[PDB]
Design a protein around this nucleic acid. Structure first.
Ligand code: K
Ligand code: K
Ligand code: K
Ligand code: K
Ligand code: K
Ligand code: K
Ligand code: K
Ligand code: K
Ligand code: K
Ligand code: MG
Ligand code: MG
Ligand code: MG
Ligand code: MG
Ligand code: MG
Ligand code: MG
Ligand code: MG
Ligand code: MG
Ligand code: MG
Ligand code: MG
Ligand code: MG
Ligand code: MG
Ligand code: MG
Ligand code: MG
Ligand code: MG
Ligand code: MG
Ligand code: MG
Ligand code: MG
Lengths: 151, 206, 82, 99, 101, 127
RNA sequence: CGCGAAGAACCUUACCUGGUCUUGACAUCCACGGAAGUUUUCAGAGAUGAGAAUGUGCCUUCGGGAACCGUGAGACAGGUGCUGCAUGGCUGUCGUCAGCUCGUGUUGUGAAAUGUUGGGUUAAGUCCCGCAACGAGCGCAACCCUUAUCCUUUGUUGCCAGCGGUCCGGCCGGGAACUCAAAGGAGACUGCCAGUGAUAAACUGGAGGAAGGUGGGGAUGACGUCAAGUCAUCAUGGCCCUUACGACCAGGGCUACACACGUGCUACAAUGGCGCAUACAAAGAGAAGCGACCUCGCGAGAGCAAGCGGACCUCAUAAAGUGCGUCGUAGUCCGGAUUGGAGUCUGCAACUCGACUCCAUGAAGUCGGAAUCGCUAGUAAUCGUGGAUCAGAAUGCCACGGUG
């Protein structure tokens, strides 16, 4: 990306709800181009949150999403052979992307039977501000305010 | 870098094929090789008759070979015993009967095959390559050619180290597919080895 | 392996072996045909089968019937590396 | 009856004019001519190594296209058959007739 | 060059249509269970061996027609890859132009 | 009268006939729910008849060929678009803004010599 | 370093052991004797050595001349023997990088410079201004192929909207609308509208449009560099062999195995494994070939046998996908290496050394150290299909579509 600056690419809403955010979620969960599998898994986990521990069925997702979204990041900048870890503000879309990626990768490394109920537990405890996605956020923060002097 | 063959890249665009028969994959290979044999003959017995192109065409079950030549009198001979003594053996080689026609090239200095043959014939007569090359270029350019370039390569003048020496004049746009490019190659077998000659002649676009 | 529709054996080996079982056992029968099935007909005779440079003698026991002759003459020499 | 004519060639202009020559010489004897129809062209591809030795990724790709034309005649008077069997076309066209 | 290899190959071709595609009856037919299930089929299996080691269609290497190269053969033209390229660029194989799709 | 439309996607081709005044979606002599088992294909086919709204205001007889599920669904969308554009002739302006009118011209890229895929390169290593 | 090799059981084959030949396996010329082919005979591993039968084409311008065989003596044949650092031809590479030069003029004693630098701009030595330069050439771009929209023509073997009939299958009558096929034509040009810009060249944005700024992909590789690669495709200067470094045959070997490296395939599972049911492709090949239906076999396959030189017939019922059931986190109903037994088929012949099937066996492996590779969109990832080579023998190579 030296010269050619890029616009954006379209994305469909979700059949069942009509969301772009959750359509992003299932693209990030999809593996190998198996979209049907990922739609099945994500619907199966999200209703499992809603009527087991939860609200109106789109709200129950965003409440777990907001508590893992980071507000500050670290990016590194070189001197002549030194690189400072400078804290930077994260842009909205990158906030959603980082949150979704951390949720998916925390759900992938659990020990329960299905992927739907793994996702279910992780989103449920992200709603309760514990687990490992939220602590991923907490320690990216920790490191960002450890280097607060290099702003 | 290596170049594309300038006649091959223009087949079907502006340059036609040298064989215009049809065949299924049953008789394709033998058609091809009997064409090779006839071409090898009509190369090697018309050696000093200045033949430039041999077009082979196969109607239903028999052949006709059109010989483009600069010196039609020797390939038509003394009242015409010689196209007889040629078709009697071409019908012998291709197994089917044969017919022979003879077309004249009227300016033998605007054909890459004849110019290459000329330069190799002079090189085998122990002539300085510079003089051959420059005479070819000036003779081709004084007859209306829009461009020409010749190139000789390999132990020029008996040197121990081979060299490639080329001479260009006019305009030879090898990257233009519209371009009327007449290209050909020849080899001179001297007492120090083989010397390769390539000739490009540009006559116009479309 | 081969089809059950006929085992294979050569002609010259077949005739050499029949005449050797009529005439009593003899010299190690020199052969090059490593591809021929061992038959019941030559239990007891010694066949020296070619292995590339030599003729290895084999004394046919009844356990060998059904195998090929070449199985009893190794073609490659090898005994350790270092 | 019906007579069926299949034309194969390596280029499309020669076979185009050959099909013309057929279908107007068929209307010249006053016959009904069904067609001409272009059947799908069959293109055979070849891929060759282009160095003399040890250069696996350097290759050339060629193709031969065979063009196929079909024409049916459905009202043959006796002067249509001979009138089609006397016709002179250049060497690139292979014709197959079917009674 | 190795002219002797070309001689071997042409001898195999000639001797092979000499015997087989004419006397395949010794294997294609007599092996049939409807032809024999006994000493006849055995006698045929042993007769198939006294025919020369050649004369099989399975011993032709199918070399090039001009240089005699074993490898890179193309059944469509009867030439090696080198010869089909050198002759295709010169414009001698009908209809064979460079493909780009 | 019939109002007709042709639509095409990756390798599929769909012809669409619309009649006034009934609610049948029938594709290849089958229901929509019998044909497309995936609700995303069902959603893509109902897209153009959601801005151009209906209850059961036109019935549509569709056939399709070639391609897979997504290709056929996109082809049917494009065909419905063209057919209803022949029907009204001035629903065009808002269909342009929905992206339903542009023929998606993304085709699968050819495999190239020396490459394992269209662009995937063999594993390189310095030595 | 899945490179020559687009396919080493024999052959290929160039290597080894042994058995053999010497004007020769391949070619021309000379002399003599036999027309060529036939189809059996015993020895030999085989190359090679030993009888019967036979033909007589052809004009004889009646000596024999033409095809094929045997023997003799020589010019000679033959060499995948060496030199790619003697060469031609062909190829890789920097690199599809934007450059590399020339004529005339001018400047400098001269090697040389200028032009080709400068201000902008572009993917581009692309274009515009300015300028001791003025012009030109090879490159860039365009012309070529393919893909994305529409129109015209033709309408089977391809198609089925409106019609009649039907055994409910476009299958019959029938239609020429539609998909499609393949010829021709149209379309995109910063063409249009705003703004910025040095009244510039061009940049941002908008409209219309199937497509917008090189629309996507390919072919196309400038002057030259690396004494780069190939004398084993071929061709070729010189050197070397000439009862052998040439030629024929059988068996073996190129498949060895303490190890090290490169490129791939299959896994370590639940986004999964197994069982049943059921959808949606594209592009190809086929006459010593593709081989349907039916019958037999658990299966690989076998028997019989139609159709097809092919928009008709066959290869050939796509798989991932969807629905239901089960397994429930285990070295497992994961993995399928290794080995034993029984077979099929191709082929003179599967020991060394083929592919596939059935029953049994069920290693390692639980996501991989230092480190390292590919990819910017129908791409990556994954899932099947086809082709060349080829009697048989792909996890390789070259192509095609699905999901994405
Ligand atoms: K084997
Ligand atoms: K060279
Ligand atoms: K100058
Ligand atoms: K040499
Ligand atoms: K071997
Ligand atoms: K592999
Ligand atoms: K590896
Ligand atoms: K197991
Ligand atoms: K094969
Ligand atoms: Mg073979
Ligand atoms: Mg793909
Ligand atoms: Mg490779
Ligand atoms: Mg410069
Ligand atoms: Mg300068
Ligand atoms: Mg320029
Ligand atoms: Mg200037
Ligand atoms: Mg029409
Ligand atoms: Mg260009
Ligand atoms: Mg070197
Ligand atoms: Mg070397
Ligand atoms: Mg060598
Ligand atoms: Mg051998
Ligand atoms: Mg090897
Ligand atoms: Mg495990
Ligand atoms: Mg890129
Ligand atoms: Mg797979
Ligand atoms: Mg494949």
């Amino acid at each position: 990306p030296r010269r050619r600056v890029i616009g954006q690419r379209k994305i469909l809403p979700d059949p069942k709800f009509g969301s772009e955010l959750l359509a992003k979620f299932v693209n990030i969960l999809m593996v190998d181009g198996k979209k049907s599998t990922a739609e099945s898994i994500v619907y199966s986990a999200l209703e499992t949150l809603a009527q087991r521990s939860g609200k109106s069925e789109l709200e129950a997702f965003e409440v777990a999403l907001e508590n893992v979204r980071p507000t500050v990041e670290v990016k590194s900048r070189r001197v002549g052979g030194s690189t400072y870890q400078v804290p930077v503000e994260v842009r909205p879309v990158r906030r959603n992307a980082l949150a979704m990626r951390w949720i998916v990768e925390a759900a992938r490394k659990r020990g329960d039977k299905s992927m739907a109920l793994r996702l279910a537990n992780e989103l449920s405890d992200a709603a309760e501000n514990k687990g490992t996605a939220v602590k991923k956020r907490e320690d990216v923060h920790r490191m960002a305010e450890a280097n607060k002097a290099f702003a | 870098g290596q170049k594309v063959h300038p006649n091959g890249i223009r087949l079907g665009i502006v340059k036609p094929w040298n064989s215009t028969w049809f065949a299924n994959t049953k008789e394709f290979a033998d058609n091809l090789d009997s064409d090779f044999k006839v071409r090898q003959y009509l190369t090697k017995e018309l050696a000093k008759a200045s033949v430039s192109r041999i077009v082979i065409e196969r109607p239903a079950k028999s052949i006709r070979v059109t010989i483009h030549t600069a010196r039609p009198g020797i390939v038509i001979g003394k009242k015409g015993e010689d196209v007889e003594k040629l078709r009697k053996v071409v019908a012998d080689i291709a197994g089917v009967p044969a017919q022979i026609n003879i077309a004249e090239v009227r300016k033998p200095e605007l054909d890459a095959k004849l110019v290459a043959d000329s330069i190799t014939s002079q090189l085998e007569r122990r002539v300085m390559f510079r003089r051959a090359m420059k005479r070819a270029v000036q003779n081709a350019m004084r007859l209306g050619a829009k461009g020409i370039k010749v190139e000789v390569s390999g132990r020029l003048g008996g040197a121990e180290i081979a060299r490639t020496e080329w001479y260009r004049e006019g305009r030879v746009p090898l990257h233009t597919l519209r371009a009327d490019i007449d290209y050909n190659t020849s080899e001179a077998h001297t007492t120090y080895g083989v010397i390769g000659v390539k000739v490009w002649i540009f006559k116009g676009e479309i | 392996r081969s089809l059950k529709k006929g085992p294979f054996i050569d002609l010259h080996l077949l005739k050499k072996v029949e005449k050797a079982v009529e005439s009593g056992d003899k010299k190690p029968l020199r052969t090059w045909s490593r591809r021929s099935t061992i038959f019941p007909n030559m239990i007891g005779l010694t066949i020296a089968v070619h292995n590339g440079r030599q003729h290895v003698p084999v004394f046919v026991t009844d356990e060998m019937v059904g195998h090929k002759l070449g199985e009893f003459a190794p073609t490659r020499t090898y005994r350790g590396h270092a | 009856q019906r007579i069926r004519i299949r034309l194969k060639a390596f280029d499309h202009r020669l076979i185009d004019q050959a099909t013309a020559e057929i279908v107007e010489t068929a209307k010249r004897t006053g016959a009904q001519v069904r067609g001409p129809i272009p059947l799908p062209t069959r293109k055979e591809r070849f891929t060759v190594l282009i160095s003399p030795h040890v250069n696996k990724d350097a290759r050339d790709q060629y193709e031969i296209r065979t063009h196929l034309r079909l024409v049916d005649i459905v009202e043959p008077t006796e002067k249509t058959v001979d009138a089609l069997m006397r016709l002179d076309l250049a060497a690139g066209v292979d014709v197959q007739i079917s009674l | 060059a190795k002219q002797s290899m070309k001689a071997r190959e042409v001898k195999r071709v000639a001797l092979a249509d000499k015997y087989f595609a004419k006397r395949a009856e010794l294997k294609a037919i007599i092996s049939d269970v409807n032809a024999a299930s006994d000493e006849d089929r055995w006698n045929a299996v042993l007769k198939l061996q006294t025919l020369p080691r050649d004369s099989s269609p399975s011993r032709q290497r199918n070399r090039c027609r001009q240089t005699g190269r074993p490898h890179g053969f193309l059944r469509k033209f009867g030439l090696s890859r080198i010869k089909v390229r050198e002759a295709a660029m010169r414009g001698e194989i009908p209809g064979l132009k460079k493909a780009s799709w | 009268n019939q109002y007709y439309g042709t639509g095409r996607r990756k390798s599929s081709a769909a012809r669409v006939f619309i009649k006034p005044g009934n609610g049948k979606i029938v594709i290849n002599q089958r229901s929509l729910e019998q044909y497309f088992g995936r609700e995303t294909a069902r959603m893509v086919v109902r897209q153009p008849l959601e801005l151009v709204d209906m209850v059961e205001k036109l019935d549509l007889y569709i056939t399709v060929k070639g391609g897979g599920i997504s290709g056929q669904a996109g082809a049917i969308r494009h065909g419905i678009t063209r057919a209803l554009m022949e029907y009204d002739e001035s629903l065009r302006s808002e269909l342009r803004k929905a992206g339903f009118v542009t023929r998606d011209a993304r085709q699968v890229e050819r495999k190239k010599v020396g490459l394992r895929k269209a662009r995937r390169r063999p594993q390189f290593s310095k030595r």
